[PDB]
Amino acid sequence: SFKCALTKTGFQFYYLPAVYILVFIIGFLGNSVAIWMFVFHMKPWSGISVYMFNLALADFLYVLTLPALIFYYFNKTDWIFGDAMCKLQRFIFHVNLYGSILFLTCISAHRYSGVVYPKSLGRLKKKNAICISVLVWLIVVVAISPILFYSGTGVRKNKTITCYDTTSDEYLRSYFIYSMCTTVAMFCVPLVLILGCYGLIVRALIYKMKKYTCTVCGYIYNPEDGDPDNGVNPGTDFKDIVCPLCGVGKDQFEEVEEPLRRKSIYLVIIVLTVFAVSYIPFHVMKTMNLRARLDFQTPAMCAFNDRVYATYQVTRGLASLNSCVNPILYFLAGDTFRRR
Numbered sequence: 347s348f349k350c351a352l353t354k355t356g357f358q359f360y361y362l363p364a365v366y367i368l369v370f371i372i373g374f375l376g377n378s379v380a381i382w383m384f385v386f387h388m389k390p391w392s393g394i395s396v397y398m399f400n401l402a403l404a405d406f407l408y409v410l411t412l413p414a415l416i417f418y419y420f421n422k423t424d425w426i427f428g429d430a431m432c433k434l435q436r437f438i439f440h441v442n443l444y445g446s447i448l449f450l451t452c453i454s455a456h457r458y459s460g461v462v463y464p465k466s467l468g469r470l471k472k473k474n475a476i477c478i479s480v481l482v483w484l485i486v487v488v489a490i491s492p493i494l495f496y497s498g499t500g501v502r503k504n505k506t507i508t509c510y511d512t513t514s515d516e517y518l519r520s521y522f523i524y525s526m527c528t529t530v531a532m533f534c535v536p537l538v539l540i541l542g543c544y545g546l547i548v549r550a551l552i553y554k555m556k557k558y559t560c561t562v563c564g565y566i567y568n569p570e571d572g573d574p575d576n577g578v579n580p581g582t583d584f585k586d587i588v589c590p591l592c593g594v595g596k597d598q599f600e601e602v603e604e605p606l607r608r609k610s611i612y613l614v615i616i617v618l619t620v621f622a623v624s625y626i627p628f629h630v631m632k633t634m635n636l637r638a639r640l641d642f643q644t645p646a647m648c649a650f651n652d653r654v655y656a657t658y659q660v661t662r663g664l665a666s667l668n669s670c671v672n673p674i675l676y677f678l679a680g681d682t683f684r685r686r
């Protein structure tokens with residue numbers, strides 16, 4: 347059985363530990379602040395707050411495991427924590443990955459319901475968000491539990507201990523099949539669902555006219571309500587046309603800050619960037635690398651497999667970066683921190 351003599355040193359053995367240190371420092375800080383802010387500076391929690399707290403919980407838990415991984419790279423890739431801790435290290439990475447994707451889908455589906463179908467179902471949205479969150483954690487734990495079988499420690503020829511990121515050669519093909527099932531069900535399907543929600547969010551927002559406020563008095567002109575007292579039909583745009591309150595001209599009017607529109611665009615921008623930079627490259631490369639390891643072990647393919655392996659290492663770092671990028675979403679796409 348021919349095998350491609352893999353030789354990649356001086357790059358990946360510096361990159362991943364540096365990214366892991368960066369993610370630990372920024373991720374522990376941001377998620378500690380977020381978890382502190384939701385628990386002690388938010389009462390009651392809205393629908394999105396429940397999903398955002400769960401996303402922060404998935405990130406902090408994963409961030410908590412990083413020093414072990416950083417140690418492993420600083421210890422010439424020799425795992426000293428045992429078989430069980432290796433399995434738990436790998437399980438948590440995948441639980442964080444898929445839990446994050448599913449909670450991002452929850453936030454996306456929730457904003458679509460708020461933007462398209464807006465009425466005060468405050469407690470109804472909170473109770474449903476808690477129930478959905480529990481189900482999401484149950485789905486993720488169950489679907490990701492095989493990682494506890496596949497992953498584990500292995501003794502190298504030089505007597506060192508590897509903590510397998512995938513699995514042993516005996517279960518590798520089975521692992522690829524399993525990974526394809528989770529890639530399709532917990533990455534591909536949520537991605538199509540997020541895109542649909544975002545397309546419908548952008549469609550609903552672009553089809554509606556913007557409100558204008560007076561800098562002199564503070565009167566808000568609604569395009570749908572209009573101003574029939576002066577001679578403006580309800581439904582007409584601001585450009586189609588004096589202020590009914592104070593009496594100043596149109597020149598003293600500026601566009602109103604819409605909280606739902608701003609939080610929706612921020613979510614659309616941040617999530618799409620995160621899928622384009624982290625989620626999509628990682629899933630493509632994870633798959634490509636397993637495919638090369640299983641089906642492309644011929645001398646003519648070795649050079650290409652090396653490039654795939656190196657590119658995959660890059661995406662592993664990008665995948666981990668989400669843990670320190672996600673807190674930004676709680677302050678730019680989330681509800682204000684208030685205790686009522």
Ligand SMILES: CC(C)CCC[C@@H](C)[C@H]1CC[C@H]2[C@@H]3CC=C4C[C@@H](OC(=O)CCC(=O)O)CC[C@]4(C)[C@H]3CC[C@]12C
Nearest residue numbers: 367370371372374375412413414416417418420421422
């Ligand atoms: C309170 C938080 C927000 C501040 C973050 C503190 C950092 C300065 C700490 C936390 C994680 C630490 C790392 C955790 C793990 C390791 C692995 C450790 O590995 C070894 O000891 C193996 C050496 C060998 O056996 O050859 C070396 C220190 C290092 C890089 C640590 C250096 C200092 C770090 C980056």
Ligand SMILES: CC(C)CCC[C@@H](C)[C@H]1CC[C@H]2[C@@H]3CC=C4C[C@@H](OC(=O)CCC(=O)O)CC[C@]4(C)[C@H]3CC[C@]12C
Nearest residue numbers: 393448451452455456459474475478485531532535536
């Ligand atoms: C039997 C086969 C066909 C199932 C395929 C597996 C997955 C494609 C399914 C199973 C569980 C599903 C998840 C179950 C629950 C949700 C919560 C849902 O969030 C809401 O309903 C938000 C409600 C709100 O707060 O307004 C968004 C989709 C999502 C992640 C689903 C996405 C698709 C998943 C991963």
Ligand SMILES: CC(C)CCC[C@@H](C)[C@H]1CC[C@H]2[C@@H]3CC=C4C[C@@H](OC(=O)CCC(=O)O)CC[C@]4(C)[C@H]3CC[C@]12C
Nearest residue numbers: 621622623626627628630631634650653654656657658
């Ligand atoms: C308007 C549409 C076309 C933009 C779609 C946005 C994303 C879905 C794109 C932007 C960057 C793309 C990635 C750019 C680079 C690669 C590396 C590429 O790796 C290889 O070619 C392997 C061998 C090598 O490293 O040369 C595999 C596809 C992938 C992940 C691409 C998958 C699709 C991504 C994430």
Ligand SMILES: CC(C)(C)c1ccccc1Oc1ncccc1NC(=O)Nc1ccc(OC(F)(F)F)cc1
Nearest residue numbers: 374409410411412413414415427431432434435438
């Ligand atoms: C977080 C637990 C559940 C222990 C864990 C599970 C699986 C794999 C690794 C793992 O964590 C560790 N295992 C062995 C050695 C180190 C760790 N992790 C660890 O030390 N995390 C840590 C987290 C926070 C922390 O406080 C600090 F941020 F530095 F202020 C100091 C250390």
Ligand SMILES: CC(C)CCC[C@@H](C)[C@H]1CC[C@H]2[C@@H]3CC=C4C[C@@H](O)CC[C@]4(C)[C@H]3CC[C@]12C
Nearest residue numbers: 484485488489490492520521523524525527528
């Ligand atoms: C009730 C809800 C949450 C559905 C959960 C279904 C779970 C139990 C399913 C979904 C995907 C499945 C895996 C898909 C592929 C493989 C590879 C095969 O070689 C061994 C079984 C294994 C590893 C499956 C075991 C069961 C599995 C983990």
Ligand SMILES: CCCCCCCC/C=C\CCCCCCCC(=O)OC[C@H](O)CO
Nearest residue numbers: 357358361372376656659660667670671674
């Ligand atoms: C709260 C604010 C959020 C802060 C967000 C943190 C900023 C992102 C950090 C680094 C970007 C990633 C750079 C990726 C560079 C990869 C290219 C590379 O050099 O990797 C090759 C390596 O040798 C392996 O083979």
Ligand SMILES: CCCCCCCC/C=C\CCCCCCCC(=O)OC[C@H](O)CO
Nearest residue numbers: 359360363364365367368371372375419420
């Ligand atoms: C909000 C506050 C801002 C926080 C921002 C701070 C983030 C630190 C950034 C880079 C540190 C990474 C250090 C680079 C360490 C490289 C690891 C290495 O040398 O590899 C180990 C090697 O394998 C052993 O032989």
Ligand SMILES: CCCCCCCC/C=C\CCCCCCCC(=O)OC[C@H](O)CO
Nearest residue numbers: 428429430431433434437484487491494498
């Ligand atoms: C109703 C709510 C139900 C919630 C469900 C809770 C499930 C917890 C999930 C993972 C923790 C288990 C971590 C398992 C760590 C692996 C250890 C192991 O199994 O040991 C391997 C081997 O035997 C040693 O050599």
Ligand SMILES: CCCCCCCC/C=C\CCCCCCCC(=O)OC[C@H](O)CO
Nearest residue numbers: 429433487488491492494495496497498499
């Ligand atoms: C209500 C639903 C609650 C269910 C929650 C799901 C949690 C599943 C727990 C373990 C997965 C089964 C995988 C078994 C992991 C043990 C490790 C193993 O399989 O051993 C491999 C090898 O022998 C050692 O090197």
Ligand SMILES: CCCCCCCC/C=C\CCCCCCCC(=O)OC[C@H](O)CO
Nearest residue numbers: 615618619622623627653654656657660661
């Ligand atoms: C609406 C806002 C959406 C914003 C849209 C943003 C588009 C993202 C573009 C590129 C990120 C993909 C990064 C892919 C990482 C591959 C790096 C690589 O090629 O690996 C190097 C390796 O060393 C060589 O062999």
Ligand SMILES: [Zn+2]
Nearest residue numbers: 560563589592
């Ligand atoms: Zn006025």
